[PDB]
Amino acid sequence: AVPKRRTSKTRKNKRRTHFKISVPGMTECPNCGEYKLSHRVCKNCGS
């Protein structure tokens, strides 16, 4: 129930290979000079 040995800087950086965030949809507004969320609306993004 307790780590027998300590992890290195190579085995610790290998586990953080999938630990990341994905990019958003960024549905560019038709004509308003803003940015609306995918299938959403904003006070600046007209479309």
């Binding site: 969320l37 299938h39 959403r40 609306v41 904003c42």
Partner: protein, 119 residues
Amino acid sequence: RKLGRTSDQRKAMLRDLATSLIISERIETTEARAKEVRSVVEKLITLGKKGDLASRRNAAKTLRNVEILNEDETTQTALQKLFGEIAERYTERQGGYTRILKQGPRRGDGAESVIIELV
């Protein structure tokens, strides 16, 4: 069907939202809550179309018996406005048709904010 709290608690909350969305036109809440109050509000508008005594008594089993309208500057008690104004304004095949508009997430948590207005 979806959940959230306990059987009794859920029921109570649902009734509150429905009554609050009948005397405020448009309101903003969460996604799940807006996708569950769009089936208990449309059924209430269907009972208002009939305009019979039986329906009126069945419409008082959900609508809260309070919330006296203050914007009408009178003694409107929800039901009257629903069985007089809301009912006398809809003639579509979707009875109490309502639309929902999604928006950005909240700051507190990550819940997706949404708006449900009457149509």
